[PDB]
Each structure stands twice: as C-alpha cells, then as structure tokens.
Design a protein around this nucleic acid. Structure first.
Lengths: 217, 452
DNA sequence: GGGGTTTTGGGG
DNA sequence: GGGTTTTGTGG
DNA sequence: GGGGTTTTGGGG
C-alpha cells in the first residue's frame, strides 16, 4: 500500500524507470526534510526509516558557507537539514567498497542546496537502516539487473545452439569439460555484465574529506 | 580449584567472584557498544532456577569484553556454559550475574547434544563429552570432579527441554500481532525456506504457530546454522512498516537466531504442527512483478539431505576441485534467464535409439530436449549464463514439467501447459531447486519436478 | 591481589 | 543489563 | 609495564 519511507519510494521509482529522473513522479520532487545521523567520516541522513548518503556539489557547499557562515557541515550530526534543490542519478560502482550501494549499482541523491534547522528539531524514529540493505529494495535492484540481463541474453544468444543429444546419450566412453556449458550473456569487454540501457548520470561531487579540510585543515 | 554453585543458591550479599555451570536458553549476539566495549546478554537456567510457577524462570548473565572474539556465540538453546569469577547482584528483581571477561572472568561452552552446532555444520565428531567446543582465553581446564556436574546437568537439560517448552509464550510474540508492537520483540517460528539472496545474505521465510508468514535477512557468516524445516527462536526483531509487497522482519547487530537441542519439546511440536505455506507464491504468480521469491521445483525425497553446489563451483571448479571431481550427482539452485529452443513446440523431439539422433517432432520416439540458460547468486555479477539440460531420452527428468513428452505441434493441451511453464521459469524471482547428473561435460536435470 | 610476563620491584 | 558498532554484508 | 581494580604498595 502506502510507502512510509520517502527515500525508499524515491529510489525504487528511479530504478523502476531505468535511472531516468524525469520519469519519476513530480509529486515527489518536493523539499526533503531529513535528520542527520552521521557527518564524518560518512555523511548520512535519514527520512525516519532509512539512511542515504547525500552527494553535495561544489556549488551547494559554497552557497551554504555563504548563507550560513561558521556553521560547519561536518558537524551537523544529530541536527536536521532541508534539501530544497536535489536530483537523483544512477551510477555504476564497486559495492565491495561502497556500502551505500548494491550489486555494483548505486542511486545517488545529488544535493544542490540545503539549509540547517538547529531549532531543537526532534522526531521519535525507529533505528535507521541502510536502504541498500533493505530486502524489498535489494529485490528491486535485482529485478532491474534481471531485466537488463534477459534483454541482453535474448539479443546475444541465437540460433538454438543445443547440445547434440549424442554427446549425452552415449556418454559411456565420453569425457567432457564443464566449461563447455558456459555461454556469454552479452557483448561485453570484461568478466562483468555491463550491458545496461540506462545512461549513467555524471555530475561532479565533493569527497567528504575535502569538505572536512575546507573547514578544518 | 574451583567451587561451582547453583544459580538459586549463589550469594547476593557476598560480592565475591562465584563460578557456576548453567544451561543457556537465550542470548543476544555479541555486539559492540562503543569503541572499546563488547557485550553479550543471556538467560541461564539450572536445577534450582528454571521455572516460575509455569512460565520459565531464569537468571541473567552479562559478559563484558574488549574484543568480539572474547564473547560466546550462542547458536543453540539448551547447551551448557561454565563461568568463572562472576559477581552476582539483584537487577530489577532478577538475579544478574556479571563477568568482565576483559579482566579475570572466563567462560566455556559445552555441547548438550552429541555435537555442537559448528560440528554439525562441518560434520565433525566431538573430541570428547568433556571438551568445551568454545571458551574464552587461550586455555580451559576441566577437573575430574567437574565431569559429574557436566554429565548430570546435560541429563537435566534434556529432561527440562523435553518436558517443558522452556521458551514460554511470554518470551515471544505471535507473527500476526507483530505490527501491534511498539518496539522490538521475539519470535519462535519454523524455517520454511532459505533463499540465497546474494553472496553474503540469506533470506529466511518464516511461519509461526499463528500461521503468519514473514521474511527476514540473515547474513550467511553470522547465522550459518539456519536450515529449512527447523525451528528457531529469533531474539529481537522489529516489524518493517516500509515493506508493502511482503511481510518483513528487521534484525539488528545484537539480534540472534537460535535453534533448539534435539530433546526440545517445543521445537518438536512446532516442526510437526507448522506446515509449508505456498499462498504467498500462488498470489505472486498473478502479478507482473513479484518481490517475493518463488521456488518452482521440488527435489525427490531421497535427495532432501544432499548438500547444494553453486553454479560457480559446478562450471568453474568442477574440473579442478578434488571433492567435486569425485561426484557425478549434485544439487543446485538457480534462475532461468532463457530456454532453448525458443519455440516451445520444438521442446519435444523424436529420438532414434539406434542412431542417437533427434529430429523436429515432425517425426520420432518422443523425448524432451530442452536447454536452460541459468545463473545464480555465486555468478550474479559475471557476464556468463550457464547451460543446464533436460534431455529425457534415458529417463532423466522425464516428469519435470508434469507433462509427458508428446508432439507439441499436435497436442494443444501439452503445448499450452509447457508454454505457461516457460513464462513462469523465465519470470523474475522464479528459481529452480534441482538435482543434476554430470555426463560428458554437461549437467542433466533428474529426480526434479515442477510444483506449480 | 593476582595475570601474564619480565617488569623480576614498582605506576596510576 | 531488552541493546545501536563499522569491521559500514558476524561485530 | 600496564589493566583492572582497589591491592592504592608490593608477590611470584
């Protein structure tokens, strides 16, 4: 029924629309009011159910450091922030190194403008969990991959190259190598499947460490 | 020399280090609290403290340490723990035993059953009935006088678990009432299925006495003892209100999944009372997209105990690994990405027994010649798809589709049922559980059949 | 006081 | 102690 | 020597 988590609904719609942020519901592109769980070494914000890592543009931080002097970003822990201008992009990453992702795929929350509300901002919430560790969301990403995999295989595999029945019907004096059953899923370059149709968004972003040096050498 | 005292007889006044043997009936997983502190909370019982007048009564034990490795991992309820230098105090009416493992306290776990959990998983035999399967510090010593204590406590443990539920109705919440809880709660349910979501995670399909079904993520490394058809107690779960497509329980780093010793009356009754549910699967088959996994097949009873082999090992190591080379029959799980030949009508061909050749069923001895292209969790990220055959000319897998071979060009009934099965098999979140026989470098499905 | 350790008597 | 770390997919 | 723990300086 109704999805309580704003992030879960947002990210799920992004994946169900092939990473196209223009296809996601417009009634969801409103300002995001979220609590800051962590600020360093990882900046993580919650929506009352899950936590995601926001990616600030160099413009977003400069605009911040101007309208809100001395109020450091790497110290916003346990305080709320309001993201007025943001966008969502899909990126190919190494999940073994990025915990805010899954299956080498990540949905990024690009932040263009955000304001802090230190006004004793509260909200009794359940313990926030990594959206990319959620059962349903992981499944959504698996659906996404399965769809891309199936489309690539049905385009790559053709001619019905069936194993000759004789090779397995008279296997008394016949020996074979199991790797003969391996079939390429697509026209790739390496050992990883990468035949996706969504255009990987770019957009430059700041490393959480640079914003720490910019405020405290 | 150590003097062991019984739980109910331990001194609350003398804040001196005491030692005891006890049966563990509950425990959190060892968890970190800050940068230098780890903790494990458990409930313990013995001949003098085991039953409130009906509900199970118990003492508590809190172990403090500076390292994760210095705390006991309780995978099973009913095993025995031995503690040295514990301080007893009253905490909100209950007898609480505290032990700072990081200082001078120590613990040792003894298996109540023949083998410990880990020993059961790795099919190992216990060194002896007097050897701890786990303990703190570099060494553990058991004196001759301790043997009788251990042997008598085991006998008592089995009597206790076989004649009492031990985990009484006041220690867990019915799954169909989970949504009414304000916070976390406990659960007692049967594992109906263990689905390998990915490289590091299992998805448990649970069903308790209330008949409700719930899913929950279980890390492979953390809970390697989860097995289908077994009953477990889950310590600390929460209802996921963000899950709309299916009922999900959320676990925390301190949450724990505990099985029961063989003599457990509770586990025995639940194992028999709680029967498999396929309602979730049947309903999902009406949707274009199912966030719930559906295992479409069932393997012959005689293979139920056979361990599974991943596609990674089957196709990439089967010709190099010693263990895999000595085996010709394997059990594996996978999902079908594509089925060949494309035209379902050509799935059945005519076979000539003498020339070992098959032809379009525009002529021959009817058999199935289907080639599935599959993939699984172990090969999820690679750029491969694997061939798994269903060549029934010799009888292997003849009843897989629950449709006997026939000219699909003429028999409309058979063609339709096979076409419907095709769509189901290639559908997202559909999986196959099957046994295969290796022949001339290929794997042929056998003793496996669809259940939908 | 008592561990493990080496400090082998003596700090915080 | 019926709890909340990162080792951020045992902790 | 250094922890935890009180023994608060000193055993083996």
């Amino acid at each position: 029924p109704q999805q309580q988590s704003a992030f879960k609904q947002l990210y799920t719609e992004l994946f169900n629309n092939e990473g196209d942020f223009s296809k996601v519901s417009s009634n969801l592109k409103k300002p995001l009011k979220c609590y800051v769980k962590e600020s360093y070494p990882h900046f993580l914000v919650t929506d009352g159910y899950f936590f995601v890592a926001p990616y600030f543009t160099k413009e977003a931080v400069n605009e911040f450091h101007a309208k809100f002097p001395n109020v450091n970003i790497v110290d916003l822990t346990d305080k709320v922030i309001v993201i007025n201008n943001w966008s969502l992009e899909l990126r190919r990453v190494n999940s073994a190194e990025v915990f805010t992702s899954y299956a080498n795929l990540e949905a990024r929350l690009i932040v263009h403008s955000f304001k802090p509300n230190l006004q004793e901002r509260l909200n009794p919430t359940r313990y926030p969990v990594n959206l990319f560790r959620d059962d349903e969301f992981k499944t959504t990403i698996q659906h996404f991959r399965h769809t891309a995999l199936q489309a690539a295989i049905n385009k790559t595999v053709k001619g019905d190259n069936l194993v000759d029945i004789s090779k397995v019907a008279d296997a008394a004096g016949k020996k074979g190598k199991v790797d003969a059953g391996i079939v390429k899923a697509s026209a790739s370059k390496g050992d990883e499947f990468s035949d996706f149709s969504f255009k990987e968004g770019n957009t430059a972003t700041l490393k959480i460490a640079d914003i720490f040096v910019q405020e405290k050498g | 020399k150590y003097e062991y005292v019984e739980l109910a007889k331990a001194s609350l006044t003398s804040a001196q280090p005491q030692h005891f043997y006890a049966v563990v009936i509950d425990a959190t997983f060892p968890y970190k609290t800050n940068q230098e502190r780890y903790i494990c909370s458990l409930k313990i019982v013995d001949p003098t403290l085991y039953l409130k007048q009906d509900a199970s009564d118990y003492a508590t034990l809190v172990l403090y340490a500076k390292r994760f490795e210095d705390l006991p991992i309780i995978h099973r309820a009913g095993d025995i723990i031995r503690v040295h230098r514990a301080t007893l105090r009253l905490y909100n009416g209950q007898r609480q035993f505290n032990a700072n493992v990081f200082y001078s306290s120590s613990w040792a776990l003894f298996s109540t059953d023949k083998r410990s959990v880990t020993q059961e998983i790795n099919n190992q035999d216990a060194v002896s009935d007097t050897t701890p399967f786990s303990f703190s510090s570099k060494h553990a010593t058991i004196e001759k006088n301790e043997i009788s204590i251990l042997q008598n406590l085991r006998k008592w443990a089995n009597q206790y678990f076989s004649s009492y539920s031990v985990i009484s109705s006041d220690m867990y919440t019915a799954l169909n009432k989970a949504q009414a809880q304000k916070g976390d709660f406990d659960v007692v349910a049967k594992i109906l299925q263990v689905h390998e979501l990915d490289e590091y995670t299992n998805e448990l399909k649970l069903k308790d006495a209330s008949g409700q079904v719930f899913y929950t993520l279980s890390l492979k490394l953390k809970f390697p003892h989860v097995r289908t058809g077994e009953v477990v107690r889950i310590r600390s779960a929460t209802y996921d209100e963000t899950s709309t497509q299916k009922k999900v329980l959320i676990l925390s780093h301190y949450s724990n999944i505990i099985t029961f010793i063989q003599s457990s009356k509770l586990a025995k009754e639940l194992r028999a009372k709680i029967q498999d549910d396929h309602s979730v699967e049947v309903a999902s088959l009406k949707k274009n997209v199912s966030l719930n996994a559906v295992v479409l097949t069932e393997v012959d009873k005689k293979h139920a105990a056979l361990p599974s082999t991943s596609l990674q090992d089957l196709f990439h190591h089967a010709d190099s690994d010693k263990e895999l080379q000595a085996q010709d029959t394997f059990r594996t799980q996978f999902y079908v990405t594509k089925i060949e030949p494309s035209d379902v009508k050509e799935w059945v061909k005519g076979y000539d027994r003498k020339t070992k050749k098959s032809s379009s069923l525009k002529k021959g001895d009817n058999i199935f010649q289907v080639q599935f292209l599959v993939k699984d969790a172990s090969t999820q990220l690679n750029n491969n798809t694997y061939r798994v055959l269903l060549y029934t000319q010799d009888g292997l897998g003849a009843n897989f589709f629950n449709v006997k071979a026939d000219n699909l060009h003429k028999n409309a009934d058979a063609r339709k049922k096979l076409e419907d099965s095709a769509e189901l098999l290639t559908k997202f979140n559909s999986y196959v559980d099957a046994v295969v026989e290796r022949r001339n470098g290929f794997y042929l499905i056998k003793d496996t059949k669809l259940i939908y």
